[PDB]
Design a protein around this nucleic acid. Structure first.
Lengths: 49, 255, 325, 319
DNA sequence: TGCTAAGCGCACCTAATTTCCTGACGGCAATCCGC
RNA sequence: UUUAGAAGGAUUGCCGUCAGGAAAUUAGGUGCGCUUAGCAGUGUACCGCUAGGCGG
């Protein structure tokens, strides 16, 4: 959750990540040559979780 | 009142954030503008009214925390996770989530409009940039906080400007395909996180950090940007990232 | 009344250590000479000497085990190691970045100012300067050292240096003049009487001529390569800030069973050192119960428990309520 | 105490530095030293590898170009000089991880009992016997007129060693210099002295323009001979010096049949004699589960083996 | 305490060809799940 | 008011043995480096009679 300036006041923004986007990026960057980094961090147990 | 330009020269950020759902690299631009608004709100609390409305983002050196493999790719490291609040908080080994970290040397040119913009304000920023963080990283050291006049006192470095016309005028399909084709055509162009678009409506939910300010759920929206030298930058005002709001769009734009 | 903790209580660090960089020097020219220390790659041929099932042992006991590694050693003509790191001490009241309830903020600010009244962050600060002056931040680089010399430079004043082999790692001294001088400034920085404190620490460890230097190891998950990937900061060896900070938070000597195990542990929430695999403060002297007995069911806890709660709040973290659906 | 800790590990107690190679002349060996550098050597060969009968017909008279490297002395030098140094660290202050405190207390009690019986003196005498016989010169001990090993601790240069007068299958316990160095390593291992830095310099008179064999580096993917360069000059791995210093085990079950020492490993593996010599009840795992987990006064030879592995180190951790 | 000012530094033709570039064995154990 | 705030990656190791790079050669032709000037700036700084000022 972060704050964002809206017209002299502020709006709290709780950011929800996108699963489907990340999936589409991972599909469309295996078949490509733009700079890319694989994030080997999430184990299968936590991904199941 | 008195417009001016303050340059925070060679700020060395240590262990900033680098993950924005599909990006591992340069932090979000909302983070640097949040450093700006945090500097603004802490100066306006020492009774120094200074409204910061435009930030330049210059880059001198970087080090993504990790190593470069023999095949030329990047492997990103993480600190060992400690006690993380939850059901498994008493176990000695904690879960590892997606996280990336970067080290940056950056210079921030700010568009400052206050009653008086003098070198006392520069001393106030010096006494205010040692209790703040850029992205989520600590400031090890800064060179100098100085006032600049034109595009000649600016040191050498490569700014970040928004290149959306290289993304709207791209190959086809959907915006991800336009992005991938555009990054294939211009290899000196990077994806950048540029703000947020709402996924709900303004209202009060339970669990907020501040229970009295409005709240909206958001996704991050991303675009393209590129690097231009300090010598070859025309009339400044095109390296100045500024807040811009719409109905459902929380965007950081170079106008 | 206050019947819980806030739905989003957060705290920032108040002892912000920086990454370390390793240098190689001589000792009779340690104030003038400074050479870079680089991390080499050392590949090894080993034997499979790990424990395996008795069926796999008959098939693999005499099989070669090649492994990948990295190693940092000194030069053939420089006998000392120079580590230089910096800290950013910050106030405790001005490190609360988030709090939903206003009354909990008022109550916690009252309890921090009551701690400023009685022992105003001074015993904790003396313990943090002892963990600089015994050089606990030399984790495996403190073993096999002829002379260890630690120099602290607050602002621009260079304080008299420390003989870090004359301090015991399990006894905190409260009588050295240099430690008291540094600790009063750290205490005033934690109170809020100073808004920031910049401390720069430089160490000199005379291990020997071409001996092994031990940087911090990076957790890098790669499927193709699985080796000792050490930490390179700006091309040269170094240590993470978390390693040095975990060394400096080893000040807790107020756990329920200190008389048996007589060694300081790092200040964590449930008392979870990574050496001993049993939680050292798991129910009655944990931070969550000892802050819900301090702020919610008002009560004057003993000063050792107040030391532990304040040391957690200097460590900082996500300290909210058991989040519900 | 049931079962070893989930995170149990030990650090080395004999830290050996990487070795640097030099060239001298033997009558000028105390006043003159030059760098020895590795030279690339591309070699053309015949196809002498064993091939199946449908490949030999096509590739028996085919040229075999191969890349390689070599180290050779100069035409004016007759002696190789190897310089390394050893840091001796205490044994109780070497457990890097132990999740149980009772197991730490039991290990410290059994090490203190060993200090009571033999103050790490037989092990240290064997280590100085593998410094004095010059076993760290692996293929550089073959074909040498005179080998002189000098040992320097602090600022005292101990009397030099005629390394060629030492059999490699026996261990001398009556040499004054070996006993005097081994007593210092013994007191360092025990705890009386907190550290000991021992610097070794060995002069190998092999001859003029003869070959010096460094340590070859390991290649993993799909290679040629890459030899070790320590600070530009040729050199050897610390691993190779330590595997020649831990060749002290004459306590395995089948010693009376094969009467030579082997390096001290967990399952008793020896790559020279390609047989495991400690595959069962006389291995470290079953001698540390019968010394601390089920208290039993082991024989003294087995105690020598357990303390020798606790000087070697490793991840001895149960699931 | 000075050490010069001025012009300019080629046009052509090309840069080989054969045979090949090793065989072995092996590449760790632990831990990183909320409900 | 910053995808906010928090985090010890650790311990251990033998890369080895072996080798024919080799045979042949045309680099050539051609050419304007010129003009001019104070080693001057006093060219030196000593011989005597506490700090300071003085015969020739």
């Amino acid at each position: 959750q972060v704050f964002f300036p809206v017209g002299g006041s502020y709006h709290l923004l709780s950011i929800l990540p996108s699963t489907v986007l990340n999936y589409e990026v991972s599909d469309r960057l295996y078949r490509s040559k733009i700079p890319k980094i694989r994030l080997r961090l999430l184990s299968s147990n936590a991904a199941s979780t | 009142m008195m417009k001016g330009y303050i340059l925070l020269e060679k700020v060395n950020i240590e262990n900033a954030n680098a993950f924005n759902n599909i990006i591992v690299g340069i932090p979000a631009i909302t983070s640097f503008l949040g450093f700006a608004r945090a500097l603004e709100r802490k100066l306006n609390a020492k009774e120094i009214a200074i409204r910061i409305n435009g930030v330049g983002l210059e880059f001198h050196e970087y080090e993504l925390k990790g190593y470069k493999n023999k095949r030329g790719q990047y492997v990103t490291s993480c600190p060992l996770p400690g006690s993380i609040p939850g059901q498994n908080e008493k176990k000695l080994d904690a879960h590892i989530m997606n996280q990336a970290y970067i080290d940056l040397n950056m210079s921030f040119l700010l568009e400052v409009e206050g009653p008086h913009v003098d070198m006392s304000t520069c001393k106030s920023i010096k006494s205010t940039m040692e209790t703040l963080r850029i992205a989520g990283g600590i400031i090890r050291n800064y060179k100098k906080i100085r006032l600049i006049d034109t595009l000649a006192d600016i040191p050498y470095g490569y700014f970040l400007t928004l290149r959306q016309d290289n993304l709207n005028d791209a190959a086809g399909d959907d915006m991800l395909d336009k992005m991938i084709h555009a990054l294939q055509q211009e290899d000196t162009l990077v994806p950048i996180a540029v703000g947020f678009k709402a996924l709900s409506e303004v209202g009060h939910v339970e669990g907020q950090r501040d229970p009295e300010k409005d709240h909206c759920f958001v996704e991050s929206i991303f675009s393209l940007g590129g690097f231009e030298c300090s010598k070859i930058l025309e009339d400044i005002n095109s390296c100045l990232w500024r807040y811009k709001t719409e109905e459902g769009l929380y965007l950081c734009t170079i106008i | 009344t206050l019947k819980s903790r806030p739905e989003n209580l957060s705290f920032a660090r108040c002892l912000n250590t920086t990454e370390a960089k390793f240098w190689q020097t001589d000792f009779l020219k340690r104030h003038t000479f400074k050479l870079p220390l680089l991390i080499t790659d050392k590949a090894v041929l080993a034997s499979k000497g790990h424990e395996m099932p008795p069926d796999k042992l008959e098939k693999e006991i005499m099989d070669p085990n090649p492994q990948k590694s990295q190693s940092c050693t000194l030069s053939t003509e420089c006998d000392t190691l120079r580590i230089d790191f910096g800290i950013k001490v910050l106030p405790v009241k001005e490190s609360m970045y988030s709090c939903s309830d206003y009354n909990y903020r008022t109550a916690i600010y009252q309890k921090i100012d009551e701690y400023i009244a009685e022992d105003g962050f001074l015993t904790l600060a003396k313990r943090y300067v002892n963990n600089i002056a015994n050089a606990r931040f030399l984790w495996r680089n403190r073993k096999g050292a002829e002379i260890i010399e630690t120099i602290v430079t607050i602002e621009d004043k260079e304080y008299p240096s420390f003989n870090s082999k004359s301090f015991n790692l399990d006894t905190f001294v409260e009588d050295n003049a240099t430690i008291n001088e540094i600790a009063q400034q750290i205490a005033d920085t934690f109170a809020g009487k100073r808004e920031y404190l910049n401390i720069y620490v430089t160490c000199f460890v005379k291990i020997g001529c071409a001996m092994e230097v031990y940087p911090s190891q990076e957790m890098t998950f790669d499927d193709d390569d699985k080796g000792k990937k050490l930490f390179k900061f700006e091309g040269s060896a170094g240590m993470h800030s978390q390693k040095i900070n975990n060394a400096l938070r080893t000040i807790d000597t107020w756990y329920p069973d200190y008389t048996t195990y007589e060694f300081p542990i790092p200040v964590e929430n449930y008392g979870a050192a990574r050496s001993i695999g049993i939680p050292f403060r798991p129910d009655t002297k944990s931070f969550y119960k000892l802050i819900d007995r301090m702020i919610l069911k008002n009560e004057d806890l003993p000063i050792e428990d107040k030391h532990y709660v304040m040391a957690i709040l200097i460590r900082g973290g996500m300290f909210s309520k058991k989040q519900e659906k």
